[PDB]
Enzyme design. Sequence first.
Site, mmCIF file in Angstrom:
data_model
loop_
_atom_site.group_PDB
_atom_site.id
_atom_site.type_symbol
_atom_site.label_atom_id
_atom_site.label_comp_id
_atom_site.label_asym_id
_atom_site.label_seq_id
_atom_site.Cartn_x
_atom_site.Cartn_y
_atom_site.Cartn_z
ATOM 1 N N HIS A 40 19.679 75.562 30.045
ATOM 2 C CA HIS A 40 18.531 74.962 29.387
ATOM 3 C C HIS A 40 18.481 73.462 29.414
ATOM 4 O O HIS A 40 17.460 72.901 29.091
ATOM 5 C CB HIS A 40 18.401 75.501 27.975
ATOM 6 C CG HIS A 40 19.175 74.791 26.942
ATOM 7 N ND1 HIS A 40 20.446 75.165 26.591
ATOM 8 C CD2 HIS A 40 18.781 73.848 26.042
ATOM 9 C CE1 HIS A 40 20.825 74.435 25.556
ATOM 10 N NE2 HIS A 40 19.834 73.630 25.200
ATOM 11 N N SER A 75 24.381 69.373 24.502
ATOM 12 C CA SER A 75 24.161 70.615 25.250
ATOM 13 C C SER A 75 24.622 70.405 26.672
ATOM 14 O O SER A 75 24.361 69.337 27.262
ATOM 15 C CB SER A 75 22.637 70.963 25.330
ATOM 16 O OG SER A 75 22.171 71.353 24.077
ATOM 17 N N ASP A 94 23.323 81.127 29.110
ATOM 18 C CA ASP A 94 22.945 79.727 29.221
ATOM 19 C C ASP A 94 23.966 78.931 30.058
ATOM 20 O O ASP A 94 24.905 78.329 29.539
ATOM 21 C CB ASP A 94 22.806 79.152 27.789
ATOM 22 C CG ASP A 94 22.043 77.838 27.771
ATOM 23 O OD1 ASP A 94 21.495 77.476 28.848
ATOM 24 O OD2 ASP A 94 22.044 77.130 26.701
HETATM 25 C C1 LIG Z 1 16.367 75.261 23.814
HETATM 26 O O1 LIG Z 1 17.563 74.676 23.352
HETATM 27 C C2 LIG Z 1 17.839 74.660 22.007
HETATM 28 C C3 LIG Z 1 17.047 75.403 21.120
HETATM 29 C C4 LIG Z 1 17.380 75.364 19.772
HETATM 30 C C5 LIG Z 1 16.535 76.203 18.806
HETATM 31 O O2 LIG Z 1 15.771 75.616 18.065
HETATM 32 N N1 LIG Z 1 16.701 77.527 18.710
HETATM 33 C C6 LIG Z 1 15.862 78.340 17.766
HETATM 34 C C7 LIG Z 1 15.136 79.345 18.679
HETATM 35 C C8 LIG Z 1 16.134 80.127 19.540
HETATM 36 O O3 LIG Z 1 15.497 80.858 20.562
HETATM 37 C C9 LIG Z 1 17.038 79.269 20.385
HETATM 38 C C10 LIG Z 1 18.026 80.197 20.970
HETATM 39 C C11 LIG Z 1 17.692 78.259 19.535
HETATM 40 C C12 LIG Z 1 18.411 74.559 19.293
HETATM 41 C C13 LIG Z 1 19.214 73.840 20.192
HETATM 42 O O4 LIG Z 1 20.264 73.010 20.036
HETATM 43 C C14 LIG Z 1 20.587 72.549 21.324
HETATM 44 N N2 LIG Z 1 21.573 71.699 21.584
HETATM 45 C C15 LIG Z 1 22.090 71.051 20.425
HETATM 46 C C16 LIG Z 1 23.129 71.749 19.595
HETATM 47 C C17 LIG Z 1 23.110 71.490 18.234
HETATM 48 C C18 LIG Z 1 24.084 72.059 17.413
HETATM 49 C C19 LIG Z 1 25.047 72.869 17.987
HETATM 50 C C20 LIG Z 1 25.033 73.175 19.333
HETATM 51 CL CL1 LIG Z 1 26.217 74.233 20.058
HETATM 52 C C21 LIG Z 1 24.066 72.595 20.133
HETATM 53 N N3 LIG Z 1 19.829 73.079 22.252
HETATM 54 C C22 LIG Z 1 18.920 73.855 21.560
#
Ligand SMILES: COc1cc(C(=O)N2CC[C@@H](O)[C@H](C)C2)cc2oc(NCc3cccc(Cl)c3)nc12
Lengths: 250, 27, 11
Positions: free
Chosen positions: A43, A198, A99
């Site tokens: 992603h 990420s 991913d």
């Molecule tokens: C598309 O990429 C992302 C989406 C989302 C998101 O809002 N989600 C809600 C909906 C669901 O379908 C998704 C699987 C996750 C969050 C993300 O956080 C990160 N990277 C930052 C990071 C911060 C905290 C912990 C770690 Cl391991 C990583 N890339 C994200």
Amino acid sequence: IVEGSDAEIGMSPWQVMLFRKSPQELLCGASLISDRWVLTAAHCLLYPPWDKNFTENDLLVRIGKHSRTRYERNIEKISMLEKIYIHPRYNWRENLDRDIALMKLKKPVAFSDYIHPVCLPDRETAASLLQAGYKGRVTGWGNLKETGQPSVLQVVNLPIVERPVCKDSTRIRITDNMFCAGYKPDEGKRGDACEGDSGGPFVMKSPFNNRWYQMGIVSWGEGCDRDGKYGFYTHVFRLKKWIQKVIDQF
Amino acid sequence: ADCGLRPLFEKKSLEDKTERELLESYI
Amino acid sequence: GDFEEIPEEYL
Ligand SMILES: COc1cc(C(=O)N2CC[C@@H](O)[C@H](C)C2)cc2oc(NCc3cccc(Cl)c3)nc12
Ligand SMILES: *[C@@H]1O[C@H](CO)[C@@H](O)[C@H](O)[C@H]1NC(C)=O
């Protein structure tokens, strides 16, 4: 990285910055797995919901770095991408299942005191090390908090969390291709990845042979370092048939 | 053959400041 | 210019 600290020099010689050419900005982390192959999160390159679809010529790989913003003349090395390979069953639509992506560099990068590959786990390393309570290490140049940016590469050590607890933390469906990591509320230490981390590595040092193994790829979390939430990581070993397959064919 | 051995740490038998935290969690 | 300029050979 939230609640981490500055990396030591040469601490994470496999760290790679994915750098956008225009505008010049941090895209994600990544890791060096040989002299021509870099590992990251799918992603980071492809994510239709946010209109992300990066081509090879959009990006560069910066290896050997410590400072976030400076050009580290005669330390870092910058490499162009020959080709991106995204896991064909990467599930961007629902939950970021699988991913994972690879990037082949145009030329081999020279190893140095600052630049050196990480090992990939085999089935035995995974079974030995991927246990609730065992800590790994997450590095990156992402945000210092959810809602600022580091001068240098940040590091945090975090425990792997029991699978039911990972599931119970979220409404998102968690697959066997993911593990989570992070302190619980009653553990009273903290730390997490955050925006811009990420793609980067979750590494463990094997106590059997004293080498570092990339067990995880920084994938996603709901906010950064929130109480009761955890970071979700791509399970590298479960996807290594694909990694081997790509690297063997190409 | 050299993967995961850092030129500034394992290669010279120096430990980084927190790698012992990892080791201590491994059992 | 948040990031320092890369040498032009890389662009
Ligand atoms: C598309 O990429 C992302 C989406 C989302 C998101 O809002 N989600 C809600 C909906 C669901 O379908 C998704 C699987 C996750 C969050 C993300 O956080 C990160 N990277 C930052 C990071 C911060 C905290 C912990 C770690 Cl391991 C990583 N890339 C994200
Ligand atoms: C991403 O871009 C490539 C090449 O430009 C294209 O073939 C692919 O279908 C695109 N996917 C999108 C826009 O979702």
